[PDB]
A paper describes a structure:
Src homology 3 (SH3)-domain growth factor receptor-bound 2-like (endophilin) interacting protein 1 ([name]) and its splicing variant, [name]α, are brain-specific homologs of FCHo1/FCHo2. The μHDs of [name] and [name]α, which are identical to each other, are highly homologous to those of FCHo1/FCHo2. The μHD of [name]/[name]α also binds to the [name] motif-rich region of Eps1519. Thus, the [name]/FCHo1/FCHo2 μHD is a domain designed for recognizing the locally ordered structure formed by the two consecutive [name] motifs.
The two structures are similar to each other, and the minor differences in the secondary structure composition are probably due to crystal packing effects. However, the [name] μHD possesses unique structural features that distinguish it from the other known μHD structures. Among these distinctive features, the most prominent one is the presence of the [name]/FCHo1/FCHo2-specific insertion of a relatively long α-helix (α2) between β6 and β7. Due to this insertion, the loop between α2 and β7 and the N-terminal part of β7 also adopt conformations strikingly different from those in other μHDs.
Numbering used by the authors: 557 to 633, 639 to 828
Amino acid sequence: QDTLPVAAAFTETVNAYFKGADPSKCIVKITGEMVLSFPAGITRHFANNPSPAALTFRVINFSRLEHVLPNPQLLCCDANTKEFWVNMPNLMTHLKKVSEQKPQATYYNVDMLKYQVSAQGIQSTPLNLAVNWRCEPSSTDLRIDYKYNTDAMTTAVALNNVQFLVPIDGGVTKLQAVLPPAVWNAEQQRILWKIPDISQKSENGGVGSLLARFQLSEGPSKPSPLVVQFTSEGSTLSGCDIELVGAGYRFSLIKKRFAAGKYLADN
Ligand SMILES: [Zn+2]
Ligand SMILES: [Zn+2]
Ligand SMILES: [Zn+2]
Ligand SMILES: [Zn+2]
């Protein structure tokens, strides 16, 4: 059983732009990459195997992907499934090069597939947002409504390190009625909320509001984009998975994760 243990990862990035409370105006773009990881020692392995067993895999739910770019050195020579035969001499050349360059490395990550995920508006979005501003001549009311949305992801999984940053115009003298607690950057004139986790297991099922009032010393505030951050582990957005075909290899791990890229909301 000289089967090389190997690892795979899908990593997805969701971009979203929300416009007031109007779902039809939400612009969504999801991208991703599939990466193969080879464990230190592969070089010795290929030293014993000049003509190794072919590395062939199949990507599940392939129809959910569009704009697929296969590694032009390692790949490319029907509905929902696509099979690949990795180019072995080029993979070994590669792995020899990076190994003789980072000999201390515990694994070598190789990019196989770059792709886009067919998205359908606000449904494809793991965190729904609606922002409302009330801009008085000397006062500003800010409301951020968020909703954890399981429909965007393959399996119900938490959002981690969630950040809500928003610039406040008009020269703020004082913060009032701030709920939950946030952090005011004075030098930068902008407010930041942090929630460590959001999910079904969160309070109110992952549905919440961020509230702030601001006293101004200069005119009204002009609303600015809410910028959001979060990461996630244990699920993809695309619903893709990977399988080995043929003998000689084993997946030691298949890591699935996604993260917010440009994730904005306007008034
Ligand atoms: Zn071996
Ligand atoms: Zn096929
Ligand atoms: Zn290379
Ligand atoms: Zn990469």
